Every structure is written in structure tokens, then in C-alpha cells.
């Protein structure tokens, strides 16, 4: 996360960390708790190719990282069938935990926005994740959750700004309407926290725009990060998750 | 990487057994641990298990009488059964899942070598 | 519960031998296995997740299953083969788990 400050511990109950095997259960890729037994993340971290459960761990919104891993067991993961690589679109995925999950007093689910919303410029939404500061800067070793305010652009605008410096002819869509574009050249997603949610306090109360996708670098000039538009997606998560 | 459970072998009829399993070289952080049970020349059978996150699973006929536990700070974990008899003689054994599942038997890789527990008086 | 079958055979070396598990309902996302256990010693993981090969295992095994019927077929036995072999499987999270009998196996020579 580039800028903003550490998040506070109360505020954001949902957040979720990948962990790999390795020499130690390593962070690699966030989450969002959105329903008591599965997990939402980005596509690109865990496909397309398959990837072994004995390798895969959940971690739930511990303040730190690696002070607290009651890590949890995945029991089977689920990508958007038209996946492929994070530009094309679809860079979606579910995980089911083996073990539902006591809602608890630091423990909640996000809630999901219903179809009908665009997300409008200028709403108040924030991204938060345990990714690199700048662009090759690790996270400091006490591994605070960094939190972020980020300002939201209209995708049609953001993909001119793509086009900028680029060869690209702008005949060609970058911005694929399923995607949407967030983030300043003060204020973005990095390295790392890939797969964590966005969401924007409409009502009060915090949808999950969408999840951390892509971009060229981070905080680079006209070049915004890319989020997964989970409203393109809603039909084929409930095809999962009842509610 | 192995196991070894550690224990008595011998007890007598209405107490507890005790048994204790130690991962020998590396941390048990991520791993659950199952009890497996032979009586001799019968098949296998399973106790339960406890899953990565803690969570204990019982067998059915288990849970009247089992309890299963976990110590980090010894890299240690601990089965004990109240009131055992002659007919819970087998040996025991305990086993890694690699997936963490605290309740799945298709994929016990790893085992300790077991030990007999003999009941009598 | 679970049935496996037969409870016991005998083969020569070079021969292929079946062995079959059937179950009252389906196992979950494919969660079967099967071990290998030697006389006096802990049991060998072979197959799991129904098909799946472990390392250190030579090719004479396999194995194949509808979800509710599956089989371990050794494709030519060896004076190595020599144990009692076991289906274990998962009919839920949490929920009924449990192994076959086995199968014991003996060497015709």
C-alpha cells in the first residue's frame, strides 16, 4: 500500500491473508472473509495453473502478520472459468475453508453491493493490504495492515489515461467493462496486496467494490491500478455462496 | 521430517491412558495430527484428529471418553483416553495431513512408528 | 461404512491384481486414498485424492473411482508387494470418515 497510515485494529474485520509453504508460511496474496465459509480473492494469485491445498493457508485479520497464524485449511478453490491472465479480464476466484468460522466480535463478513450499483466517482472507498510501500520496498518487518483512501475514476476517463505514452492504438479497450480503475500517483495498491478488497462506505455501510487486479507498477503516472468489477460478477458467485 | 509418539505401554484397567507426539525437526504450524488405532490383527481404525486451526474432530464412539491437544510451545501433541480396558489394547499410531484438514484420512503421508499400549492388570 | 473386497488373495509374482471399495454413499470432492501397510510397521501412503501417485512410488499401482466405487489395480506384483493394503475415504468435513477392512495379500510361488 503506498501511502496512508496503519489501519486501525477495529476497522477492518474482514481482511484476509494467503499464506504458501515454504520456509515459512509466507504471505503472498490477500482476501476478503465475504460469507462465514468462503473466501473471495483475485484469480491471478492462486491459478490459473493448479496449485496443491497442501501448499494453500488462510490466515484471518490478525494485526500483524506471522504474531498470531492460527492458520486456517482450504478445502477446495474455485476460478472464473474464463480466467486466463489478469488483463484479459475474470481475475476472480473463490475459496471454501474447510472450517466455517464463529462471526466473532473482530470477526465479520463484508457485505456484497447488489447489481444496480456503478460506484460514481468521488464516493469514499479505501483498500487495504499487507503489499510493498513503493516498488521494491518490502513491508517493515512489524508487518502493520496499511490502509488507504483511494479516489475512484470513471472507466472510459481511466482508459484514456492508459493510452498516454503507449502505442496502443485507442481503438483498442484496455479497460474491459468488468474491470475499474481506482488509485492516485500518491495512492495505490502494490506488490502484494493483490487480491484485497475495495470497498466504499455507501449508506454507512461497506460494499466491496472490487478486488486488487492489476497495473503497470505502482503510483506510476496516469497509470491507476485496475480492480475486478465485482458487480460484473455477482451471478456466478451465488452460484457458490447461498444466501 | 518424522514423528514419534512417546508413552507408557503398559496401564491398568480404568485409568488413563496418556500419549504424546512430537514432531522431531521442524514446526508443526500449519499441520493437523490424527490418532490411528490397530488392535491386533484387526484393521485400522481412527480416533480423531485436530486440524490446523485447532479445531478437534472425534470418532463417533470416541467422544464419550477422548481428548485430543496441542502444546506450540513444547512442538508437542497430546492424546489422552479415560478408562481405558482390555479391548482398547492396540497399538497407536499418529499421523500428519498435509492439507491441514482436521478430519480426512485419504491423505495421511507422514506417521510415527506407533507403539503398543497393552491394558492389564 | 465401507466394504472392501476381497478380504484377502493370492498372485504370482508377474501377475495383475484388483482390488475394489465401494461405500453406501458418495466420497466428498474426491477425497480417497489408499495404504500400503508392511508387517510391523506403520502403514505407506500409495494413492491419494483417488488417483493421484505419490512420489517414491513405482508405476504398478493405480487406481480409479466413480465416487462411489473405486478400485487400486497393482499392474504386476513383486516378492515387495508382500502387505495388507487399505481404502480410506471422506464422506464429509468433520462428518463420517473412516477405513475399509483391507485386503491381505500373499505371493503364490
Known amino acids: 500500500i503506498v501511502g496512508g497510515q496503519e489501519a486501525p485494529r477495529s476497522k477492518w474485520p474482514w481482511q484476509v491473508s494467503l499464506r504458501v509453504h515454504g520456509p515459512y508460511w509466507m504471505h503472498f496474496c490477500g482476501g476478503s472473509l465475504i460469507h462465514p465459509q468462503w473466501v473471495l480473492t483475485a484469480a491471478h494469485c492462486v491459478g490459473p495453473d493448479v496449485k496443491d491445498l497442501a501448499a494453500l493457508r488462510v490466515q484471518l485479520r490478525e494485526q500483524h502478520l506471522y504474531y498470531q497464524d492460527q492458520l486456517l485449511p482450504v478445502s477446495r478453490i474455485i476460478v472464473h472459468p474464463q480466467f486466463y491472465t489478469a488483463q484479459i479480464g475474470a481475475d476472480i476466484a473463490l475459496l471454501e475453508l474447510e472450517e466455517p468460522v464463529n462471526v466473532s466480535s473482530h470477526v465479520h463478513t463484508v457485505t456484497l453491493p447488489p447489481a444496480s450499483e456503478t460506484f460514481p466517482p468521488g464516493m469514499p472507498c479505501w483498500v487495504t493490504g499487507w503489499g510493498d510501500v513503493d516498488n521494491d520496498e518490502r513491508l517493515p518487518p512489524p508487518f502493520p495492515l496499511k490502509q488507504v483512501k483511494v479516489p475512484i475514476m470513471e472507466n472510459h476517463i481511466c482508459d484514456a489515461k492508459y493510452h498516454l505514452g503507449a502505442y496502443t492504438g485507442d481503438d483498442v479497450r484496455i479497460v474491459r467493462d468488468d474491470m475499474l480503475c481506482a488509485g492516485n500517483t500518491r495512492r495505490d495498491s502494490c506488490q502484494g496486496d493483490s487480491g484485497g478488497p475495495l470497498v466504499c462506505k455507501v449508506n454507512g455501510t461497506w460494499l466491496q467494490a472490487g478486488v486488487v487486479s492489476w497495473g503497470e507498477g505502482c503510483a506510476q503516472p496516469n497509470r491507476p491500478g485496475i480492480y475486478t468489477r465485482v458487480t460484473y460478477y455477482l451471478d456466478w458467485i451465488h452460484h457458490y455462496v447461498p444466501k | 521430517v518424522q514423528l514419534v509418539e512417546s508413552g507408557p505401554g503398559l496401564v491398568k484397567p480404568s485409568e488413563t491412558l496418556s500419549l504424546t507426539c512430537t514432531v522431531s525437526?521442524?514446526?508443526?504450524?500449519?499441520?493437523?495430527i490424527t490418532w490411528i488405532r490397530q488392535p491386533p490383527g484387526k484393521g485400522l481404525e481412527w480416533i480423531g484428529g485436530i486440524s490446523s486451526a485447532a479445531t478437534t474432530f472425534y470418532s463417533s464412539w470416541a467422544k464419550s471418553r477422548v481428548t485430543i491437544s496441542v502444546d506450540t510451545s513444547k512442538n508437542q501433541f497430546s492424546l489422552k483416553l479415560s478408562s481405558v480396558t482390555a479391548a482398547d489394547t492396540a497399538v497407536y499410531y499418529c499421523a500428519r495431513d498435509p492439507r491441514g484438514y482436521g478430519a480426512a484420512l485419504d491423505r495421511l503421508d507422514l506417521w510415527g512408528q506407533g507403539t503398543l499400549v497393552t491394558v492389564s492388570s | 461404512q465401507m466394504t472392501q473386497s476381497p478380504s484377502s488373495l493370492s498372485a504370482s509374482v508377474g501377475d495383475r491384481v484388483t482390488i475394489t471399495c465401494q461405500s453406501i454413499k458418495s466420497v466428498y470432492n474426491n477425497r480417497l486414498g489408499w495404504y500400503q501397510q508392511k508387517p510391523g510397521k506403520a502403514p505407506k501412503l500409495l494413492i491419494y485424492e483417488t488417483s493421484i501417485l505419490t512420489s517414491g512410488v513405482p508405476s504398478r499401482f493405480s487406481g480409479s473411482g466413480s465416487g462411489t466405487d473405486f478400485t487400486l489395480t497393482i499392474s504386476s506384483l513383486q516378492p515387495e508387494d508382500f502387505a495388507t493394503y487399505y481404502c480410506a475415504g471422506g464422506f464429509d468435513r468433520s462428518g463420517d470418515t473412516t477405513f475399509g477392512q483391507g485386503t491381505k495379500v500373499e505371493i503364490k510361488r
Open positions: 525437526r521442524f514446526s508443526l504450524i500449519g499441520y493437523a
